[PDB]
């Protein structure tokens, strides 16, 4: 009863140019979010992208195939929304 | 290990009238998100505020206390990033 995801943590230029880049893997994801932040917060580098998948089987793919630049945090878990 | 959460979904210029709103009602939430949506799906009324919170507790005392206008869908769940 939940869904896997992965948030891409960091700065918004560097995420969009990340999301040029998976575009090209659109097979291992199945939704990407636009870049976002918590309000208040984004002082910083700490601008968002969640991406959902299928199973975690699906997510191992992503981020076995997708290389993510290092000043990029990468973070898995769950939702059930 | 879970995060409660509230996401609403709708027009982006509700979204952002509603944010005016639960500015008042700062206690009652822990963060709230700028507005997103998933790529490729806003061409509708898709566009999305997350909401978290400390406890399911102050979760209902928010949808409790903070009216939200028909025209938003409201679900509730967790998270765990």
Redesign the interface.
């Known amino acids: 009863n939940t869904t896997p995801?992965v948030?891409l943590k960091g700065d918004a230029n560097t995420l969009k140019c990340l999301?040029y880049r998976f575009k090209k893997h659109s097979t291992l994801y199945t939704?990407?979010?636009?870049?976002?932040?918590?309000?208040?917060?984004n002082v910083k580098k700490s601008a968002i992208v969640t991406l959902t998948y299928d199973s975690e089987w699906q997510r191992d793919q992503f981020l076995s195939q997708v290389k993510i630049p290092k000043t990029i945090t990468v973070?898995?878990?769950?939702?059930?929304?």
Not at 75 to 81: D, R, V
């Open positions: 995801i948030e999301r939704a990407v979010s636009s870049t976002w932040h918590w309000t208040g917060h973070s898995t878990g769950f939702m059930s929304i």
